[PDB]
Design an enzyme around this catalytic site. Structure first.
Site, PDB file in Angstrom:
ATOM      1  CE1 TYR A  44      20.172 -13.065 138.237  1.00 44.52           C
ATOM      2  CE2 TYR A  44      20.672 -15.230 137.164  1.00 44.52           C
ATOM      3  CZ  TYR A  44      20.334 -13.871 137.077  1.00 44.52           C
ATOM      4  OH  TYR A  44      20.118 -13.277 135.868  1.00 44.52           O
ATOM      5  CG  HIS A  61      19.692  -4.611 131.173  1.00 40.32           C
ATOM      6  ND1 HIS A  61      20.871  -4.986 131.809  1.00 40.32           N
ATOM      7  CD2 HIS A  61      18.840  -5.658 131.335  1.00 40.32           C
ATOM      8  CE1 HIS A  61      20.731  -6.203 132.317  1.00 40.32           C
ATOM      9  NE2 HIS A  61      19.507  -6.624 132.040  1.00 40.32           N
ATOM     10  CG  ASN A  94      16.078  -9.724 137.333  1.00 40.69           C
ATOM     11  OD1 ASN A  94      15.007 -10.008 136.793  1.00 40.69           O
ATOM     12  ND2 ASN A  94      16.874  -8.730 136.890  1.00 40.69           N
ATOM     13  CD  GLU A 111      19.809  -7.678 138.228  1.00 40.46           C
ATOM     14  OE1 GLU A 111      20.925  -7.368 138.757  1.00 40.46           O
ATOM     15  OE2 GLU A 111      19.504  -8.844 137.813  1.00 40.46           O
ATOM     16  NE  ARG A 143      13.763  -8.265 131.644  1.00 41.74           N
ATOM     17  CZ  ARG A 143      14.815  -8.135 132.470  1.00 41.74           C
ATOM     18  NH1 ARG A 143      15.432  -9.265 132.898  1.00 41.74           N
ATOM     19  NH2 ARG A 143      15.227  -6.895 132.864  1.00 41.74           N
ATOM     20  CD  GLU A 186      18.140 -10.622 134.711  1.00 39.90           C
ATOM     21  OE1 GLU A 186      19.091 -10.847 135.493  1.00 39.90           O
ATOM     22  OE2 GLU A 186      18.018  -9.523 134.089  1.00 39.90           O
TER      23      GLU A 186
HETATM   24  C1  LIG Z   1      28.021 -10.651 142.969  1.00 35.88           C
HETATM   25  O1  LIG Z   1      28.292 -10.422 141.383  1.00 35.88           O
HETATM   26  C2  LIG Z   1      27.037 -10.244 140.819  1.00 35.88           C
HETATM   27  C3  LIG Z   1      25.828 -10.259 141.648  1.00 35.88           C
HETATM   28  C4  LIG Z   1      24.526 -10.036 141.057  1.00 35.88           C
HETATM   29  C5  LIG Z   1      24.513  -9.783 139.595  1.00 35.88           C
HETATM   30  C6  LIG Z   1      25.798  -9.790 138.802  1.00 35.88           C
HETATM   31  C7  LIG Z   1      27.026 -10.016 139.438  1.00 35.88           C
HETATM   32  O2  LIG Z   1      25.740  -9.605 137.388  1.00 35.88           O
HETATM   33  C8  LIG Z   1      24.530 -10.338 136.639  1.00 35.88           C
HETATM   34  O3  LIG Z   1      24.718 -11.846 136.642  1.00 35.88           O
HETATM   35  C9  LIG Z   1      23.128  -9.966 137.352  1.00 35.88           C
HETATM   36  O4  LIG Z   1      22.065  -9.988 136.679  1.00 35.88           O
HETATM   37  N1  LIG Z   1      23.207  -9.604 138.836  1.00 35.88           N
HETATM   38  O5  LIG Z   1      22.111  -9.329 139.504  1.00 35.88           O
END
Ligand SMILES: COc1ccc2c(c1)O[C@@H](O)C(=O)N2O
Ligand SMILES: COc1ccc2c(c1)O[C@@H](O)C(=O)N2O
Ligand SMILES: COc1ccc2c(c1)O[C@@H](O)C(=O)N2O
Ligand SMILES: COc1ccc2c(c1)O[C@@H](O)C(=O)N2O
Lengths: 486, 486, 486, 486
Positions: free
Chosen positions: B321, B132, B319, B178, B88, B394
C-alpha cells in the site's frame, strides 16, 4: 608456486602525488631492548616474558631485541638509505614514567629527543604512536591496568608528558595501536600480555573473563583516547599544524559463500574487527551490531563521552596484512559465545566455499596475500565514514626462521612482491577517490614479533643476531632505495 | 493538488504477458455478513465487535457487511464486468467449522462451492486465502487461540477440510494473510481482535504482553503453515498442478536521512515488516536482526521445523500500500521497547530528513502514495530471496466517508491514478527481471475495513448501503473493463 | 525540523586543492554607507530609497548600512579572523565618478585603494565586481541609464578608470553582477531601482514595459561588457596575469513532474535564468529558445558584437542560492506574456508534482535548500559550455529579523549547515570533473538586502546596529576559522 | 564499394517472437491502375499526372501501374510465396466514392472485398491504410480538398464507409500515410499532387503559400483523424479486437557537428519530421518548438479537439528509409523562412562535420543507409512517448532504372543487405525494450514512385513491364521465402 607481478605492473613512485608519504614502522618493546637501563620501569610485556617465558614460541623475549635504545642511529640510517620520508615509532610509557605515573625519567625523554632530532636532521618526519601495548607494570599491579577507570587519567598524563616533551617537533600522533588486536589477544585468548582469559581456557592467567574483559579494556582505551585528544586540541596545538589519531588493525572480509547470510556476516566481521574502535571515533558509539549482540557486556558511553569521541581523529591509521572469508553463524539454543570474538556470529575462514584458500601463504601461518581486501576497506572508509585522511600505518609479511623456502634472509623477493602488490592496491583506491595519504611498511627492521619471538622476521632491513645486531638491507629495502630515487 | 499520470504513461494490458493475471481481492469477515446464519459459529472478530463495539471508529461491525453470503453472484458479476481473471477471497474458518474443530457445517461448504463453481463457470480463477484473521471464537475461548500450540493442529485440520472440499477446483492457496499486521495490531497495540496488549496500554483487553504475545502468535502461525503445506504437498497435490503460499503485508522503506545508520535502519525495518515471516518460509528461521534484538522473546525452531518451513511456498503474495522512512534508533540505557515493533530499533516516519512527506496522501491517513517502494521490494525479492513467483495479492487505496474532496464515491479518479501508477511500477520490476505473475487490487467491493469500519472505502466497485448494498462500478472499475478489453 | 549533516559528512579544507579559494562577498551599496560624503554622487538606489522609501519592507535604506566606507578595516579583520583568502567586493560607480562621466573623485579612488592595500597587506586577494546595480543617477536622469546605448560607452569609461586606478593590484574582475536578477526586478516587476514596470502593474514607476525594458537593458549590459573586456585585454593586461568575467545569478531546476514536457520546460528555465547572459559570452548570441519566443523584443547583435562577446570571459561567477521546479506552459490563444519572465513558458514552482516542497526553508521565503541543484548546474557548465573556470561568487542564506526560531543572531547553525552542504556539493562537482576554482559565501557581513532592507541577515559576521555597527563573528564564521586552520 | 553483413550477422526468423509480424506494403495509386474503370472517379494524382505530366521524371503516370486492379491475385501469391503474414495496402477513396461524397460505387467495394477475402483465404492479415495521398479530385475542385474544413467531415464519411464495408474482416487500420511528407511536398515544394507552392517558386501551381498551406492541410488531417477514430471506437469496434492508428514518415537525425547547438537542432528536426503529427496523437497538440517558431501560421486546437486527438492511436506506423545530419540555423534579421521546412531552423545534411556522408547510397539519391537511425527513433518512442505499439509499416530501397551497377533487376543483393540490416536494427530495439510488433517492407512489387515514376524500383517482387506486368521474385524475395520457412 608464488606468482609475482609482471615487471610492467610494478608501482613507480610517479604513481603517487608529491605529498604522498612512504615510510616504515616499529614499536618500542619490539626493537628497543635496554628493558631495565637508565631507570626504565618494567612494562606488562617485560613482566609477561619474565614470568611466562613459555608463551613465546621460540623462547625469547624483548630484553634486548634490536637494541635500538643504543643503535637508533642505525635505524635512522636504514630509513635514509631506503629514502623513506616517514618513520612511525612508539614511545615506551614505562621508559618515560617508570611508575606509570609521577616523576618523569630524563634519560627516557633524552632518548626520544635524540631519535627525533636525528630524524629531523636527516629529513625524516616522525609519526609517533603513544601506546603500543607497552603498559607500565606498576599500573597493572596497582589497579589492573586497562581494566580499571584509573587508566584513563593516568594515560592522559602520559600523553600530556609526550606532548610537552616532543610536541614542538612531532606534529603527528596516534594515541593507540590496534585496540582490537590488543583486546582480543590480551584479554580474550590471553596469548598476549597481561595474558588473561576465562577459567578453563588455556592462557598464562586464566582468571579473567574472555566475554567481558576485552570490552572493559576496549572501553577504557576509547575514554583515554577521548581525554587525550581533548587535552591535545585544547592546549597543545597552538599553531594548528598538528594531527592526532589512532591506528586500527583491520582484516579484509569476503562472504564465505554467495548468500545474503554471509553478506550480513561480512558486515558483522568488519564491524567487530574495524568498527569496534573506529565507529566510536566517528559517531561516538560502538556499531549497532555489537551493541545488539553484546548488550550489558559492552559499556555504555555518557552523552559527553559520545560528543568527545565523535570526530576525535584528524588522521586514521590502518594496519593491513591479510583478509578472511566471513561465514554466518546462527543465533540458537545450541550455541553460546566463549571468546569475545564469538560475539560477531561470523567465523573467519581461511578457505572459502569453493574449497580454495583466500590467497597465497606468505610465511607465517596467518598472513594470506589478498591485496583486494585493502582496496575494499579503503573504499568503505571513503563511502561510509566520510573519507577521512587514511595512512596505511602497517603492512608487510614475515619470513619464518627455518622455512626451507626462505634460506637466505636477505633474498626477500616474496615480501617485495607483496609490498608492491599492496602499494598498487593503494593506488587503485586513490584512483577511485579514497583519501590515502601514506604507506608505512611494517618491518623497518626485524624485531620481537610478540608471541612468535624473533622467529618471525618482518623487516625491510635484516637484523643479524649473529653479527652484533647489525642492520643489513634486504632485497626489498634495496628496491625502495631505487623506488625513492636515492 | 494531486498530480495524475500523463495519458501516454497509463499502463496498457499489452505491457504484460498473456499469462500475467489481473484480479481483485476480499476476505470473508469483510464482505460476507450472515455472521450467525446456517450454523456458522462466531469468530474472534464477531466477538471483538460484539463486546468492544467502541473500538470501531464509525460504530459498525461485520454482521452484514456487503452481504456477500447472499449476494456473491453480484461479486462474480462485477469481476466479469471488469474483465478480471482472478478472484482472491478467503474462507471463513468459523462458517465451515463452527467450533474450530470437529463436525463440518455443510451449509458452509455449500456456500464456497457455489462461489467457486460460479467463478469457474464465468472463466475466473479462484485464489483462496485459508485464514484471514477470521479465527473461531470457540478456540479463543478454549485455549486462547493463536497463543497456544494447539492452534497448530487445529489449523491443520481446517486446512485439510478446505483441501478436501475444494482442492479439485481450487489450485492456488495462501495459508495466512498478513501475519505481521495481525501480530502487531492484534497482540501488540491490540487495536484488532482479540484486542490484547500490555497492562497500562490502551486496548480492549490490556491483560497481554505487547513484547511477547505478538511473537508467540507469529510463531504458531509459521508452525501451522509448515504443517499445512507438508500435509498438502504430501496428500493433496496428486496432479502436481496446485500451488500453496502465504501473503505478506509489506511497506517500502527509504532511509530517513542519508547516513549509514539509516541504511542499517532500513534493513532492520524490512526485516521486521517483511522478513519476520518471509525469511522463515525461505530459510527456515527468523532474520538474524530479529533474533539478536528479541532474543528469548522470539521462540526457537526445532531442526525439523526449520526444514519443514524452508522452501515451503510455491508462490508468495505481497500486499503493498505505502512506504515509510526508516529512522535509526540507538540501543541505550535510556530506551526500552514497549511494543513489539520497537524491537526493530527503527521508527517508521511519514516525513523524511528534508521535511517532506514520502508521497501524496490518498485518503485514509496511513496510505501515502509511493510506487517506487513496491518496485524496490520486488527487486529485493529477486536479488536476495531467489526471485520466487510473486503475486501482488493486495494494492489499492481508501476513499474516506465525509472527505469533502471525494463527494461522489463513484468518481474515484484518485484511486485509478494510484492503481495505474502501481501497475506501472510492477511493469518496471518485470522489465528488470522480477518474477511478478499477477496484480490483485484490494477492493473488489467496499467492505468492512476493520478498525475503520465502512468509513474507509477500498473497492473498485461501490456498495450502496442506502440502496440495498447494490454493486455499482466506479470510475476505476470502468477503466479495468477497457484495460481488459471487455 | 531542519536535519543537519552527520559530523563525518562535514567538509574539511583537505577536500579541496591547495589553490582552491574560499572567500566572502559584499557590494558597495549594500555595506558602504556614506552615500553623500566626500563628493560621492547619488546612485539609482540612493534615489530609489529616497523617493520610494515604502518599497523597502522594513522602511530602511542604504544611507549608512554597515558603514564600511569608514569601517572597512573591520571587514578586512573579519576576513582575516575567518581565514578567508579572497574578498569579493564592488566599486561604487557614483563614488568614483559622481556624474557617471567626467571628472574622477580622488576621495573615491583613495577609499578603494585603502581597502585594496589593506587586503593585500593581510594576505587577502581582491576579486572586484565593477557594477553591482549601483548605477549613477546622473546617467539615469540624463538618458535613462541602461535603457539607452549611451550607457555602453559611459560604462566603458568607468571600467577603464577602475583598470587604471587598481589594475596594478587587482588582477580579477567581474564586469556585472546578476544581469538576469537586475533586468527582471528592475525593469520587469519593478521592485528594484529604478523601479520600472508596465502600466497597470504595481511598482514605483509603472511607466515602462515589462516585456521590453528588461531585454533592452540586458542588451546594453552585454554590449558594455564586450566593450570593457575588449578594452581590458587590449590595453590593461600587459603581464597577462589578469582575468575578467561576469557573475550570473542562477537557480537550479528540476522538472515539475516526470514528463518530456517538463524536461523541455526545465531547459527553457535554465536558458532564461542562466543562458540569457551566459550564452552570449560563450557563443555571442542569446539562447535559441529565447530568440524564438521573444522575437523582436530581443535585440539582434551585429557580426562584430557576436565576435566581441564570444569567449569574452576568462572566469565565470555563479551566485547560487536555491532551485525550483520547472512546470511547462503551453503556447495558446488563451495566454499572453505580461512579465518578461513569462517568455520562458515555464513557471518556477516551489512545490513539485508529488505535493512536496523542493527543499527545507532556510529563513527568507525564497531560499529553499537544494544543494543538488548547484552540482547539476556546475555539470551543465562542464559538459555543455566547455567547462570554463567557475567561481561560486555568492552562496548563503538569510536569518529573518523577528523569526522566533532564530532568537540569537549569532547562533546561525542553520546557515552553517547550509554552507557546509553546498561546499560539499561543490566537492561532488569537482570530483566529477567540474572546473570550480573557488567558493565565496554571500554574507561577509549583514547588509542592506535591497527590497528587504536589513530585516534579512546574510552575513557570516553579525553587524550590531544597536552597538555602533560593531562586527561580531557568528557560529558559521567561527567554523570557517577552524576550517581554514586559523 | 558496398560492404555486406557477414553471414553470421544475418537475421533469422527465431530472432523475433512468434507473434511478431513480417509483411510488405503498397498503396492504391501506386499499383492499381484502372484509373477510370468501373466508375472510379479521378483522384488528385490522376489529375496531377494528366495535367502536369512533365512533373514526373520518366514521363509516366499511374493510369495502369502494376495493374493490380486486375492482377491482385498475383500480389497475394507473391506474399504467400515469400511467406509474409501481413499485407499493408490502401483503399482508393475515389474508387469507392467517385465524387468524394455521396453514392458508393459497388464495383469499388467489390474489388477490395475480393482482395481482402483472397488474403484471408491465404492466411494473410490485411492492414489497411484509409488514405494515401489518393484524394478525390471532385473535392479538390469543389473546395480545395485538404485546405478546407469540409474535408474533415467528408473524410469521416469515407472512413465510415470503409469500416462498414470491411470492418468485419479488417481489424487493423491506418487513417493517414506520411502526413509530413504529404504536407511538405504537396503544399510546400509542390512536387506532389495537387502541386501547390508559393508564387515565384517552381512547381506546377505556384499560386499557394509554402509557409501556410502545409500547416493548414496538416491541421485538417489531424482533425479528420480525430473524428474518424472517435467514430470508430464508438460505433465500429463492438468486439474490441480492432486497432486504428496512423503511419508517420520519419528520418533518423544525428547532430551535424558535436555542439550543444546541433543537439538542439536535432531535437527540432525530429519534432518537425516526426512530432508534427505524432505529438498531436499523443498529447493533443503540436510540439512546443513548432508552435514557438510558426506561431499564427500553425492553427490552434480547441479543448475538445485536444482531448479527441490525445491517445487517438492504438498502433503507430513508422515508415523509415534513411537519416540526416541536423545542422543548427540561427534566428536572425538576415534570414527568413520560404518553405515550411525552414521553420525548423535545422537543415538536413547528407554529409556531417567530418566531411563524410551519413551512410552508403543505395540507388535513388535520397536513400543513404543508416540503420542506427531507426533504432534511435524506436528508443525515443519507448522512452519519451510511452512505448506504444510500433509497426515499421515501410522500409526499403530503390534500384534506379539505368544504374550500370544494377544491370539485373532481379539480383537485388543490395536491397537484401539493407533490409537485413534494418530487420537487425529492429531486433536491437526490441532487445532494449522498444515495443515493435512488426516489419513491413516497402516494395511488395515495383510500383509508381510518385515524382520518379517507375524509374525507381522498390519491390521485393519485380514487375516486368515488357512481359505483361508479370510478377517475378527477386533475390530479396527469395530470401524472405527461406527466412519465413516456406
Ligand atoms: C496502519 O493501519 C493499517 C495498516 C496496514 C493494514 C490495515 C490498517 O488494515 C488493512 O487495510 C490491511 O490490509 N493492512 O495491511
Ligand atoms: C593472528 O596472530 C596475529 C594477528 C594480528 C597481529 C599479530 C598476530 O601480531 C602483529 O603481527 C600485528 O601487528 N597484528 O595485528
Ligand atoms: C526572489 O527575491 C530575490 C531573488 C534573487 C536575489 C534577490 C532577491 O536579492 C539578493 O539576495 C540576490 O543576490 N539575488 O540573486
Ligand atoms: C526526398 O524524396 C522523397 C522523400 C521521402 C518519400 C518520397 C520521396 O516518396 C516515397 O518513397 C515515400 O514513401 N517518402 O516518404
Amino acid at each position: 608456486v608464488f606468482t609475482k607481478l609482471k615487471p610492467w605492473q610494478i608501482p613507480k613512485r610517479d604513481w603517487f602525488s608529491k605529498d604522498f608519504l612512504f615510510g616504515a614502522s616499529t614499536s618500542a618493546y619490539q626493537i628497543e631492548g635496554a628493558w631495565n637501563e637508565d631507570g626504565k620501569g618494567p612494562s606488562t610485556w617485560d613482566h609477561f616474558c619474565h614470568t611466562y617465558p613459555e608463551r613465546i614460541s621460540d623462547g625469547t623475549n624483548g630484553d634486548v631485541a634490536a637494541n635500538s635504545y643504543h643503535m637508533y642511529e642505525e635505524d635512522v640510517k636504514a630509513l635514509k638509505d631506503m629514502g623513506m620520508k616517514v618513520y612511525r615509532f612508539s614511545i615506551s610509557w614505562s621508559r618515560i614514567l617508570p611508575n606509570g605515573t609521577g616523576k618523569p625519567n630524563q634519560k627516557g625523554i633524552d632518548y626520544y629527543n635524540n631519535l627525533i632530532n636525528s630524524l629531523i636532521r636527516h629529513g625524516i618526519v616522525p609519526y609517533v604512536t603513544i601506546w603500543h601495548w607497552d603498559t607500565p607494570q606498576a599500573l597493572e599491579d596497582k589497579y589492573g591496568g586497562f581494566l580499571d577507570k584509573q587508566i584513563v587519567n593516568d594515560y592522559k598524563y602520559f600523553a600530556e608528558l609526550c606532548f610537552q616533551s616532543f610536541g614542538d617537533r612531532v606534529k603527528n600522533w596516534f594515541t593507540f595501536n590496534e585496540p582490537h588486536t590488543y583486546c582480543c589477544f590480551s584479554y580474550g585468548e590471553g596469548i598476549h600480555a597481561p595474558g588473561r582469559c576465562s577459567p578453563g581456557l588455556d592462557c598464562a592467567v586464566p582468571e579473567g573473563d574472555s566475554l567481558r574483559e576485552p570490552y572493559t579494556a576496549g572501553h577504557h582505551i576509547l575514554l583515554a583516547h577521548a581525554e587525550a585528544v581533548e587535552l591535545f586540541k585544547a592546549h597543545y596545538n597552538k599553531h594548528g599544524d598538528s594531527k592526532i589519531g589512532m591506528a586500527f588493525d583491520v582484516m579484509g572480509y569476503e562472504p564465505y559463500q554467495d548468500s545474503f547470510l554471509d553478506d550480513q556476516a561480512r558486515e558483522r566481521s568488519i564491524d567487530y574487527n574495524m568498527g569496534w574502535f573506529l565507529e566510536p571515533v566517528v559517531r561516538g558509539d560502538y556499531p549497532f551490531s555489537m551493541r545488539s549482540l553484546i548488550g550489558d557486556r559492552l559499556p555504555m558511553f555518557t552523552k559527553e563521552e559520545q560528543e568527545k569521541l565523535a570526530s576525535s581523529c584528524d588522521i586514521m591509521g590502518l594496519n593491513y596484512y591479510t583478509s578472511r572469508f566471513s561465514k554466518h553463524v546462527d543465533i540458537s539454543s545450541d550455541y553460546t559465545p566463549t571468546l569475545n570474538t564469538d560475539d560477531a556470529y561470523a567465523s573467519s575462514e581461511t578457505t572459502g566455499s569453493d574449497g580454495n584458500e583466500i590467497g597465497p601463504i606468505t610465511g607465517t601461518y596467518w598472513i594470506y596475500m589478498y591485496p583486494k581486501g585493502l582496496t575494499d576497506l579503503l573504499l568503505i572508509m571513503k563511502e561510509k565514514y566520510g573519507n577521512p585522511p587514511i595512512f596505511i600505518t602497517e603492512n608487510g609479511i614475515a619470513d619464518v626462521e627455518g622455512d626451507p623456502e626462505m634460506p637466505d634472509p636477505l633474498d626477500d623477493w616474496k615480501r617485495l612482491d607483496y609490498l608492491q602488490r599492496h602499494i598498487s592496491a593503494v593506488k587503485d583506491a586513490i584512483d577511485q577517490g579514497a583519501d590515502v595519504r601514506g604507506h608505512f611498511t611494517w618491518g623497518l627492521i626485524d624485531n620481537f614479533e610478540w608471541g612468535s619471538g624473533y622467529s618471525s622476521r618482518f623487516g625491510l632491513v635484516y637484523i643479524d643476531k649473529e653479527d652484533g645486531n647489525k642492520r643489513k638491507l634486504k632485497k626489498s629495502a634495496k628496491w625502495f632505495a631505487k623506488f625513492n630515487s636515492v
